[PDB]
Design a protein around this ligand. Structure first.
Ligand SMILES: CNS(=O)(=O)Nc1nccc(Cc2c(C)c3ccc(Oc4ncccn4)cc3oc2=O)c1F
Ligand SMILES: [Zn+2]
Ligand SMILES: [Zn+2]
Lengths: 412, 293, 224, 220
C-alpha cells in the first residue's frame, strides 16, 4: 500500500508491486482527475524531491507521494493579433493546439522575418476650500475615499505622510505631472489633488461597486461572456497604464470599480512618493494592505525596488483566478503569516483544481502564465490582451460541449 | 472570591454610547473607551470593520456570545457585542492599565520579578481556556494582554469564532509576529503553538527588544524566514536567572516533540518559585504611570 | 493516380488549403477501391475541417442573429441560409459518397464502424442545422448501428469507439435533449476505458487519452 | 447599397471566411465612391488576409519544393496554380487602386496609406516573380513607397500609425527583396527615433515593438 496525494488534496492508495512503473498504475487516478502521466511530477521525501514515472514500487513501498502538474498540433495561419508563446514574438503562420490554445512556431522549438500587423493650467494643484471634503466612505490599503463635491462628482483621499520634506514635495509635483495624463475609458478621471490640507489623491467617484464586492458579497457569478469581457477591459486599462511605465502596483479586486456592469474603471494606484515612506531620505517601501494580490517577489521585498511590469501581471493572475472560481485563492488557510511565508518561499502556489467546470482550457495557459513563481516568465500585458481578445470572440465558436477533434497532424 | 458581574448591562446601541477618549493605537484594531448612560461604567470599545457577507458576520456575531460563559478573573470579561455602522463593536472590560505595550514603551523594560507573576497568570489563564472550553488563545501577544492598576492582569482576544479567525486573517496586518513555526510550515499543532507564542512574548517583555533580529528594521517577510529556518533566539543571561532560562528555553523550541506540555510547565520548580515570593502591583504601576489607587 | 492524389492532399494539408484537399480526396475515393488507413484519416480530416469551418461560421452568424430591426436581422438571415446551403452541399457530397461507395465496400469491422460514425456525425451536423426529425432519426440509426457493431470486435479503449461514444452523447444532449442518457453513455464508456486501460499500443496511446480527456470534460460539464 | 455591402463585409469579418468579404469589397469601391476610414480599413484587412493565406501556402509548398523528385514535381504545379490565383488576387485590387482609390485620394492620410498598400501589393507579386518582370515589379514598388514616404513627414504626425507602418514595410522591403539590410536598418532606426522623441495607442506601440525587434534581427 503506497498512499499518494492528488491535487485538491485527494487521497488514493495505489497497489504495491514490483516490475511495473508508476505510469500505468497511477494512470487510473490521474485520468479520473484527467492528467496525462507524461506531464506530471511526483515527489518523494527523505521539502519535496521530484521523481519521475519510471520507478518501480519496490523501493517506493510505504512512502507517501504528491501529485502535482509540471499536445496535438495542427497547422494554421493566424488572421489577427496572435503572439507566439515560446519567443513572445508576433506570429502570423504556425502551429496551434486544438484544445490548450498554445500557439508557437516550429523555428522556435534564408529564413523569414516580421512585417506589419493586421491593423484595425487645465489640470493643476487643487486649492483648498473649494475641495469639499467628503464623508465616511471606508478604508483600504493606505487611505480612505472622501466623496468631494466640486463642479461634479470627485473623491478625496488621505495618506500616511504628514510633514514630508520639500524635495519629496517636488517629487509629488512631478508624479502628478506624470500621472494626471492617464486619459482612458478604463480609468476614472483625475481632477487633481489638494496638498494644502493633509496630502490627498483626488479622483472621481464611481457607482455600483468594486469587483471584490461583486464576487464575495453579492456573488452574482456571471457567464464566461462577461467573465472574459471583464478581463479584457481590465487588461486594456492595465496596458494603457503600462505603456508609459507607470506600474499600478495596487491591482486589487476591491479597486476595480465598474459602473452599470458595462463600464469598467480602475484607479487608486502608484504614489511611489507616499509609498516608500520618507522616514529619512530613502524609498523604503512598506507592506500595507491585502496580501493575495502581490507576487512572491513583492512579498519577499528582497530588492530595494522589487516591483516590475511583471509584478503587476501576477496581480492580474490573482484577479483572474478570483473571477473564474468566484472565490479568492488561499481561502482555506486559516492564517495570515502562513500565507505570507508560503507565497514568499514558493513552496505552494494557488490551487488550480478549484477552477470552474466550464473553464476554457485555452486560458489554462493564460491565467496559469499569469501566476508563475518566477517573474521573467509571466507575460507582459500586450500579450495578455491579445490572448484575451482572441477568445473574447472565439467563445461562440466553442459555445457547445466537446466533440471529436482532428488527428495529430504534426511531423518532426 | 473576586465577584465579577456583568448583568447591569441591557440593550446596547450606538445612540446610547457617548465617547470619552481613546485607550491607544493597536496593530490590527483601534481600541476606544466610551460611556453608556444606563450602565454608567466605562467600557473598552474595540471597533473593527470587515466588509464581509452579512450571513457570515451574523454567523460570527451569535458565536461571539460564548464569552458570556467564558468568565474568570484571568480573562477580560465580555460586556456584549452588536451590529451598527457596518463594523464589529467588541465591547470589553475597560482596564486603566491598558496592555503591556504602553507599559513597555513607557518603562523601557520589565524586571524578572513582574515576569514571575505574569507567567503564572498567563499560564493558568490559558489552561483555564483549554481545559474548560477545548479552544486555545492562538494570539499570545504582548499587546493582547490587558492589565489594570488594581493589581490584576488578564488575557483577551482569543479564537472565539472559527469563521472570524480567517475572516480576520486577511485584514490583521500588523508588523510583529510571534507566530509559532509549527503554525507556519503548513500544518497545525495548536497545543504547542501558544507555548511558543508566550515564550517569545515573555522575552519581548524581559529584554524590551524584538528578539527575532538578534541582539548579539527587518522586512516583514524576513522575520518569518528567521523564525522557521534557523534555530530560535535565546534570552540573555546575567540580568536574568539561569532557572528562568531553564523556563524560557523549554517554551521556545521549534520541534513540538521537544516542546514540553502544559503539565510539565506546572511541575517545574521556577514556576512554583515565582509564586513563592510576593510582588506588589498596585503601587508598581502607579509609580511609573502616574495613576492613583 | 492514387499516389499522385494522396500527395496532392499531403501538400494541401500543410497549406491550410482545405477545399482542394476535399476535392482531391473525393476523386481518390470515387475510384471504387478500398481505402487503407493512411488515406482513411486523410479523407476524414479533410471533410472534417471543410464542414467544421462552415459550421463554426454558421455558429457565429447565428450568435449575431441572437444578439439582435428589419434589415440588421435580415442581412444575417441571408448569410446564414447561404452558409446553410453550402454546408448542406458539402455534407451531401460526403453522405452520398459513403452510401454509394464507402459503406458497401467496408471490408473490415473497424472500417465499417468508422464510416458509420462518419455518417452519423454528418447527419448530426444537418440535425443541428435544421422534415427536421428525419435527419435526427437517421443519425440516431447510424450511431446505434455503429455502436452495436463496435461493441464486439476491437479493444474497448479504441479511438473509433471512444469518439463514437462521445459524439453519440453530444447527439443526445444538443439535439434530442437527453442529458441523462448522454452522461450515462459517456460515463460507461469512460469507466470501461479505465478498466481496459492495460498496456496499450503506442500508436493509439496519445489519441486515446486525448479523447478520454474530452469525455471527462463532458461528464464534468454535464454534472451541473 | 453601401450600408448593406459594409454590413455583409463585417458579418464575414468574424466568420473566419475572408474571400467573401474580399469579393464584396471589390463591389463596394468599384463604383469609385468616396472612401471613409472604416470601410478603407476593412478594404485593407480583407485582401491582406487573403494574400496572407495564399502566401502561407506559398511558403510551405516552397519548403517542400526545396525539400527535393517524383513527389517534388507535384509541388511545382501546385505552387504555380497557387501563385496564379495569388497574382489575380493582387492584380484585381491593384487595378482597383489605379482606377478608383489612388487617383481619388483626397486627404493627406488617404494618399500615404493607399500608396503604401499599392507598394505592398506590388511587393507581394515581387516575392514570386522572377526574371525580367521581377525587376519591373520591384521598381514599380520603389516609387510607390517613396511617394508616400516623402508625403508622410511633411503632412502628418511622427507618431500617427500609418507612418510607422509605412516605415516598417519600406524597411522590410529593403531586406528580403532588395537584399540591402544596411539601407533598411539605417532608415528603420531613424523612423524609430523621430517617433520615440515625440512620444489609438495600442496599435502605435505595437508597430513600435515590431520596429525594435526588426532592427534587432537585422543587426544579427
Ligand atoms: C492572529 N492569530 S490567528 O490565530 O491567525 N487569528 C486570530 N486569533 C485570535 C483572535 C483573532 C480575532 C479576534 C479578536 C479581534 C477578538 C477580540 C475580542 C474578543 O472578545 C473578547 N471578549 C473577552 C475576552 C476576549 N475577547 C474576541 C475576539 O475574537 C477573535 O477571534 C484572530 F483573528
Ligand atoms: Zn516563436
Ligand atoms: Zn494542449
Amino acid at each position: 500500500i503506497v498512499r499518494v496525494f492528488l491535487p485538491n488534496k485527494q487521497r488514493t492508495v495505489v497497489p504495491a508491486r514490483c516490475g511495473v512503473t508508476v505510469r500505468d498504475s497511477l494512470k487510473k487516478a490521474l485520468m479520473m482527475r484527467g492528467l496525462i502521466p507524461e506531464c506530471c511530477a511526483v515527489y518523494r521525501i527523505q521539502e519535496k524531491k521530484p521523481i519521475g514515472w519510471d520507478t518501480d514500487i519496490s523501493w517506493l513501498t510505504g512512502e507517501e507521494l504528491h501529485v502535482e502538474v509540471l499536445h496535438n498540433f495542427v497547422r494554421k495561419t493566424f488572421f489577427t493579433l496572435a503572439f507566439c508563446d515560446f519567443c513572445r514574438k508576433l506570429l502570423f503562420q504556425g502551429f496551434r493546439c486544438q484544445t490548450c490554445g498554445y500557439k508557437f512556431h516550429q523555428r522556435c522549438s534564408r529564413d523569414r522575418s516580421s512585417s506589419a500587423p493586421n491593423v484595425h493650467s487645465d489640470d493643476w494643484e487643487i486649492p483648498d476650500g473649494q475641495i469639499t471634503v467628503g464623508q465616511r466612505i471606508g478604508s483600504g490599503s493606505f487611505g480612505t475615499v472622501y466623496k468631494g463635491k466640486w463642479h461634479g462628482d470627485v473623491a478625496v483621499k488621505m495618506l500616511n505622510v504628514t510633514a514630508p520634506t520639500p524635495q519629496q514635495l517636488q517629487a509629488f509635483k512631478n508624479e502628478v505631472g506624470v500621472l494626471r495624463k492617464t486619459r482612458h475609458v478604463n480609468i476614472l478621471l483625475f481632477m487633481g489633488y489638494s496638498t494644502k490640507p493633509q496630502l490627498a489623491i483626488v479622483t472621481q467617484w464611481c457607482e455600483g461597486s468594486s469587483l471584490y464586492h461583486h464576487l464575495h458579497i453579492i456573488e452574482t457569478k456571471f457567464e464566461m461572456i462577461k467573465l472574459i469581457d471583464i478581463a479584457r477591459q481590465t487588461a486594456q486599462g492595465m496596458d494603457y497604464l503600462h505603456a508609459k511605465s507607470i506600474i499600478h502596483r495596487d491591482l486589487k479586486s476591491n479597486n476595480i470599480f465598474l459602473h452599470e456592469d458595462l463600464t469598467v474603471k480602475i484607479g487608486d494606484f502608484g504614489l511611489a512618493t507616499v509609498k516608500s515612506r520618507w522616514s529619512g531620505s530613502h524609498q523604503f517601501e512598506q507592506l500595507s494592505g491585502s496580501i493575495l494580490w502581490m507576487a512572491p517577489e513583492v512579498i519577499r521585498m528582497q530588492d530595494k525596488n522589487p516591483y516590475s511590469f511583471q509584478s503587476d501581471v501576477y496581480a492580474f493572475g490573482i484577479v483572474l483566478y478570483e473571477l473564474m472560481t468566484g472565490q479568492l485563492p488561499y481561502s482555506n488557510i486559516n492564517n495570515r503569516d502562513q500565507i505570507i511565508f508560503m507565497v514568499g518561499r514558493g513552496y505552494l502556489s494557488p490551487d488550480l483544481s478549484k477552477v470552474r467546470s466550464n473553464c476554457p482550457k485555452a486560458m489554462k495557459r493564460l491565467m496559469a502564465e499569469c501566476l508563475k513563481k518566477k517573474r521573467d516568465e509571466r507575460p507582459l500585458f500586450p500579450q495578455i490582451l491579445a490572448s484575451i481578445e482572441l477568445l473574447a470572440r472565439s467563445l461562440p465558436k466553442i459555445h457547445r460541449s466537446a466533440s471529436e477533434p482532428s488527428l495529430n497532424r504534426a511531423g518532426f | 472570591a473576586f465577584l465579577t458581574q456583568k448583568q447591569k448591562v441591557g440593550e446596547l446601541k450606538d445612540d446610547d454610547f457617548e465617547k470619552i477618549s481613546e485607550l491607544g493605537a493597536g496593530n490590527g484594531g483601534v481600541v476606544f473607551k466610551v460611556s453608556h448612560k444606563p450602565s454608567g461604567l466605562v467600557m473598552a470599545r474595540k471597533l473593527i470593520h470587515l466588509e464581509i457577507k452579512p450571513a457570515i458576520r451574523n454567523q460570527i456575531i451569535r458565536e461571539l456570545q460564548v464569552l458570556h460563559e467564558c468568565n474568570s478573573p484571568y480573562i477580560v470579561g465580555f460586556y456584549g457585542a452588536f451590529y451598527s455602522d457596518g463594523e464589529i463593536s467588541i465591547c470589553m472590560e475597560h482596564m486603566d492599565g491598558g496592555s503591556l505595550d504602553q507599559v513597555l514603551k513607557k518603562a523601557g523594560r520589565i524586571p524578572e520579578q513582574i515576569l514571575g507573576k505574569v507567567s503564572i497568570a498567563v499560564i493558568k489563564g490559558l489552561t483555564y481556556l483549554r481545559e474548560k472550553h477545548k479552544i486555545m488563545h492562538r494570539d499570545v501577544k504582548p499587546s493582547n494582554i490587558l492589565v489594570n492598576s488594581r493589581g490584576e492582569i488578564k488575557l483577551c482576544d482569543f479564537g472565539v469564532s472559527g469563521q472570524l479567525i480567517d475572516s480576520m486573517a486577511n485584514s490583521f496586518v500588523g508588523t510583529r509576529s510571534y507566530m509559532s513555526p509549527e503554525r507556519l510550515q503548513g500544518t497545525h499543532y495548536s497545543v504547542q503553538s501558544d507555548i511558543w507564542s508566550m515564550g517569545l512574548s515573555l522575552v519581548e517583555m524581559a529584554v524590551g527588544r524584538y528578539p527575532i533580529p538578534p541582539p548579539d528594521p527587518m522586512a516583514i517577510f524576513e522575520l518569518l524566514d528567521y523564525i522557521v529556518n534557523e534555530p530560535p533566539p535565546k534570552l540573555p543571561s546575567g540580568v536574568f536567572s539561569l532557572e528562568f532560562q531553564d523556563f524560557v528555553n523549554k517554551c521556545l523550541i521549534k520541534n513540538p516533540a521537544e516542546r514540553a506540555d502544559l503539565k510539565q510547565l506546572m511541575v517545574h520548580a521556577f514556576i512554583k518559585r515565582s509564586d513563592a515570593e510576593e510582588v506588589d502591583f498596585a503601587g508598581w504601576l502607579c509609580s511609573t504611570i502616574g495613576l492613583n489607587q | 493516380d492514387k499516389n499522385e492524389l494522396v500527395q496532392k492532399a499531403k501538400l494541401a494539408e500543410q497549406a491550410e488549403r482545405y477545399d482542394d484537399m476535399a476535392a482531391c480526396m473525393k476523386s481518390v475515393t470515387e475510384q471504387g477501391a478500398e481505402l487503407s488507413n493512411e488515406e482513411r484519416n486523410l479523407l476524414s480530416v479533410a471533410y472534417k475541417n471543410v464542414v467544421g469551418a462552415r459550421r463554426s461560421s454558421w455558429r457565429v452568424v447565428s450568435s449575431i442573429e441572437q444578439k439582435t430591426a428589419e434589415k440588421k436581422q435580415q442581412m444575417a438571415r441571408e448569410y446564414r441560409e447561404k452558409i446553410e446551403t453550402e454546408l448542406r452541399d458539402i455534407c451531401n457530397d460526403v453522405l452520398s459518397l459513403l452510401e454509394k461507395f464507402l459503406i458497401p465496400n467496408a471490408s473490415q469491422a473497424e472500417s465499417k464502424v468508422f464510416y458509420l460514425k462518419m455518417k452519423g456525425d454528418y447527419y448530426r451536423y444537418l440535425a443541428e442545422v435544421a422534415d427536421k426529425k428525419g435527419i435526427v432519426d437517421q443519425s440516431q440509426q447510424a450511431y446505434q448501428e455503429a455502436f452495436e457493431i463496435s461493441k464486439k470486435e476491437m479493444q474497448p479503449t479504441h479511438p473509433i469507439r471512444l469518439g463514437l461514444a462521445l459524439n453519440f452523447s453530444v447527439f443526445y444532449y444538443e439535439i434530442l435533449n437527453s442529458p441523462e442518457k448522454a452522461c450515462s453513455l459517456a460515463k460507461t464508456a469512460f469507466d470501461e476505458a479505465i478498466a481496459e486501460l492495460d498496456t496499450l499500443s503506442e500508436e493509439s496511446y496519445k489519441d486515446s487519452t486525448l479523447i478520454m480527456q474530452l469525455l471527462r470534460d463532458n461528464l464534468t460539464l454535464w454534472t451541473s
